[PDB]
Amino acid sequence: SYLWRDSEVSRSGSGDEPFGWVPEAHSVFTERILAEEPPYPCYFGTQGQQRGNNSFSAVDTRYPDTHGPAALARSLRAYRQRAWQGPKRQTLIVFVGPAVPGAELADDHRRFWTLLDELRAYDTEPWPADVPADPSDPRWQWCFDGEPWFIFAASPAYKDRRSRDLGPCLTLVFQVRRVFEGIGGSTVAGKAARRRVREGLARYDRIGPHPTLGTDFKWRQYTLPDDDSVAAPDACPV
Numbered sequence: 294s295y296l297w298r299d300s301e302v303s304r305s306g307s308g309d310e311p312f313g314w315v316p317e318a319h320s321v322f323t324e325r326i327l328a329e330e331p332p333y334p335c336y337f338g339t340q341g342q343q344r345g346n347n348s349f350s351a352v353d354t355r356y357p358d359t360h361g362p363a364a365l366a367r368s369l370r371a372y373r374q375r376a377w378q379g380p381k382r383q384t385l386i387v388f389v390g391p392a393v394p395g396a397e398l399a400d401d402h403r404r405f406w407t408l409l410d411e412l413r414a415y416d417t418e419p420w421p422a423d424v425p426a427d428p429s430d431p432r433w434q435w436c437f438d439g440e441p442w443f444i445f446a447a448s449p450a451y452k453d454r455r456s457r458d459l460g461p462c463l464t465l466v467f468q469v470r471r472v473f474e475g476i477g478g479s480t481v482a483g484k485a486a487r488r489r490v491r492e493g494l495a496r497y498d499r500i501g502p503h504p505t506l507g508t509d510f511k512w513r514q515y516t517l518p519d520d521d522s523v524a525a526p527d528a529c530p531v
């Protein structure tokens with residue numbers, strides 16, 4: 294099992310072994326989201342970390358047959374079970390490494406989509422009936438193990454949208470929809486939540502919230518650009 298709680302991450306690997314770069318990635322990530330001043334903009338992520346509600350996994354690109362998408366599919370099935378028990382506000386953070394000096398943002402985004410595609414082959418459940426399977430559909434979302442997920446890519450190549458620089462690796466952030474229960478967009482609590490996060494972004498990032506955050510074409514939110522560019526709705530790369 295490559296699904297880890299905070300206390301388990303140190304045993305992922307040591308030195309040049311598979312996952313040997315993971316402990317440091319984990320520390321860098323926790324430093325970013327627990328930072329005092331300015332605070333990390335998403336206080337939900339900070340709270341989740343503080344409360345022990347974040348789990349972690351990794352992909353080691355050097356060893357795709359043993360530390361790659363097949364194993365991550367197992368980790369994600371295990372995570373999904375965990376995420377529906379106990380606290381609603383859990384996240385899985387998946388580091389993809391080793392880090393690649395000099396990678397550009399478009400490169401990390403390509404790697405992200407390729408990984409999502411590779412996972413589809415290892416899904417043991419049918420695609421959910423409530424979500425269209427066609428990625429050009431306005432209501433498409435990425436699904437796995439029987440349900441849609443919220444997922445986004447973090448990268449060190451986010452220079453202006455620093456909120457999405459979580460350390461030196463391409464980093465995937467996975468959540469089941471349960472996380473958002475009680476903070477839907479129409480709700481009083483949901484409007485408060487978005488206010489608070491956005492106020493945080495305005496003290497942290499060099500660029501404001503992206504227009505695609507605002508329902509349709511959620512895929513564009515997975516791989517925000519570092520600027521105000523807006524991708525074509527029917528151009529999801531999956």
Ligand code: HEM
Binds near residue numbers: 326334506507
């Ligand atoms: C480690 C965990 C998390 C990280 C790293 C994280 C990161 C972010 C980032 C960077 C944003 C800014 C928008 C974007 O880039 O997509 C954001 C927004 C947001 N996040 Fe978090 N998040 C985490 C966990 C959570 C959890 C558990 C919840 C809910 C319970 C949550 C709810 C929200 C909401 C409501 C917004 C505001 C969206 C908007 O203003 O449109 N996040 N998060």
Ligand SMILES: NC(=[NH2+])NCCC[C@H](N)C(=O)O
Binds near residue numbers: 473
């Ligand atoms: N990192 C983020 N943008 N978080 C908020 C995700 C919003 C989510 N798709 C929803 O429908 O409630």
